[PDB]
Design a binder for this molecule. Sequence first.
Ligand code: ZN
Ligand code: ZN
Ligand code: ZN
Ligand code: ZN
Lengths: 197, 197, 197, 198
Amino acid sequence: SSVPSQKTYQGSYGFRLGFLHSGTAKSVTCTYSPALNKMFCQLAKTCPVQLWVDSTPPPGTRVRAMAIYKQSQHMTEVVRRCPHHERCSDSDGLAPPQHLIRVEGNLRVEYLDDRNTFRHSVVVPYEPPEVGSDCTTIHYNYMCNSSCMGGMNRRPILTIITLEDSSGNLLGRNSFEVRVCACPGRDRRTEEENLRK
Amino acid sequence: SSVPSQKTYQGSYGFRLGFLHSGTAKSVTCTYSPALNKMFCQLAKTCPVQLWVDSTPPPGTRVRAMAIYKQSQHMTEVVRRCPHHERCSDSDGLAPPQHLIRVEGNLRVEYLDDRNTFRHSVVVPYEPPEVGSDCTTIHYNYMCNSSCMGGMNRRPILTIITLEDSSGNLLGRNSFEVRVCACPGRDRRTEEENLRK
Amino acid sequence: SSVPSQKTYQGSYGFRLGFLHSGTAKSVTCTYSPALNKMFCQLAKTCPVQLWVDSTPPPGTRVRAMAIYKQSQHMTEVVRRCPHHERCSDSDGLAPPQHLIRVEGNLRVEYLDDRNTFRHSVVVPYEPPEVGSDCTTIHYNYMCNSSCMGGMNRRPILTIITLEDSSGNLLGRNSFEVRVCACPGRDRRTEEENLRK
Amino acid sequence: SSSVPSQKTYQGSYGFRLGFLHSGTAKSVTCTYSPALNKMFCQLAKTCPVQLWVDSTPPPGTRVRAMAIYKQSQHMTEVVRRCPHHERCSDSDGLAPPQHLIRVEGNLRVEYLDDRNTFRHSVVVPYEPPEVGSDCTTIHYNYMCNSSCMGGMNRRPILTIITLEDSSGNLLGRNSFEVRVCACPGRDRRTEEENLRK
DNA sequence: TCACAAGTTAGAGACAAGCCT
DNA sequence: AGGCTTGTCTCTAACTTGTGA
Ligand SMILES: [Zn+2]
Ligand SMILES: [Zn+2]
Ligand SMILES: [Zn+2]
Ligand SMILES: [Zn+2]
């Protein structure tokens, strides 16, 4: 219920977000719009999100992803999966059915059903970039189209990536808008070229 | 799931179906296509169906309405409501959430499934035309759009109306196709003008 | 399945990959394209890969070969043999049926299943160049066409050659694209001459 | 290997004949029949209408079996089944076992069979008289693998044997036709015809 | 009554690509 | 090996179809 802050806060470690340049090819599964700060992606397909830091955080550091409705009218409402996809039986064996945001590839992922705020969140332990890399990449999945009747229902959302210590304190925070659709390449091009109005 | 017969059969009482002429307007809620034998109607809106008989059946006679998928590859599936709509709580106080076809106004209505075929059906006791009238009218509601994700899923259906004695024996039968869409007038006009081949 | 990095990393030893000049003469079994960094080869045929290093590594050092899908959409998916080639009598007695990449000769070869990751890989104990030669050559086999239905399914892959300490630490890695087809000479000549567009 | 059922056309005591729909070699058709080749070109999992013609209505309890056998002699004794790939992806009919190549749409009294001795796959429906004004009974068949499926039919042509049987399985009538399951029926039929003459 | 939003589908040739004249 | 075989791409588009000036 209570709205988590979305204010971009790099913190003491210079926590920034990175994405791949994929282009609006109309055959792409996931693309990012720097102008809109928005990720257009297909249902249940891979969403590569990069983590850039000026300095390596202490071990036991985890990262948290949470979805919140963008419009102020809907902010108090928890982001859940539509009743259909919830009973679709597509679980990876790790993620709860109702959760929208999943993490594939990571073995020690945890899924949170917040006792008080009722909000859904997913966490993985932070890992420094492999030797010679510049950043850590996390693959996210979104388990419902933005237009799904019974959940997001054509309401745009934001994904909040939060860097936490082992205790759960805030270290860094960044965010980006997400549209889950059938044609990311088409809808990104359309939406970008509509911003002129 | 064994497929109920759909062959029309007027029987010993000359059981016929009647409909209202509403015309493919722009703001119409329900419209019947004689050429297609198909009823285009909005979600949860009133669908008037008339019952015509040559001779008044014995008392205790019941009228059943059942929905089946028209296409052969889907016939063996039970027609229900989408996971979303069966949880929206729009219940009229009488109908169970998962039933697609409702009857409004009729207090002596019963909502049934079948012991073996598992199919949903709604019944009302047949009442003769009040003196002056030549038929009796039943108001049906369809509680899911034909395109409902998780429900009918863009699959067209047939509504089978059967005249039964108290025991459940067949007395008469008729049927028609149903599209539950947002714009009945538009979609009926489209399908009819597409039949020109 | 943790996504293994394709970060080309020569490390402290200057680990580089070399190949034989075989030419795109139709009727070659295995050829390498320097421009594409891509190896075109026939099914189950010998693929010579030689290892170039500035300084001889300590004994107990091993060389690991692993397959991975090039595209981001499929990167999360493990690389296996098609369901058909899995169950046909191919096994040399050493290699598991599921594994795509195997090593000819080299009796000290080991194939792992990676309980946690589930990713297939094959290892060889590193042996210094024989006297006169300036590199160590390894003969690899690819046990499925790139176009194998149910397997790679026309999706291009990369082979990740990693240099490892016995404990499994990273010393250096390189990678190259692999197309397993019927006509390597034809397909290489075609793909190279298409890059001019 | 597995023994070979006879393919010889035999109309029997009831004049059992096969009928097909005239569809033409369109460039977007899903199923077409070539009278010159006695061959049906069709897409995977798409409906294949097959008609059953009889002179005299046979006794009640008589059945209709459909079975696929390889046409070429060196492959006839091999059993025809779905490729290892298509076998493992749910295509479920709601009825049909995953491994069966030939399916039947609509008919709920369908049975998917496996011979005790020949180990061959076969699909059986109870014979039902023409609902007149039809002069024949039509059956919707599916083929759940392309003829070129690696690990399956593997580009080997096949024959579909339709047999009219009594309750016990005795032969009453038998006809057959060649089947190519491809992506482009209209193209492949037009090609092979324009190759047969002359 | 239109225009838009946002998921599903289609054309036949131009190719991909494995196999056999 | 050249020719052919045979399934896929290209993929806008046009078509669904519910929602909105
Ligand atoms: Zn959904
Ligand atoms: Zn619904
Ligand atoms: Zn294979
Ligand atoms: Zn197959």
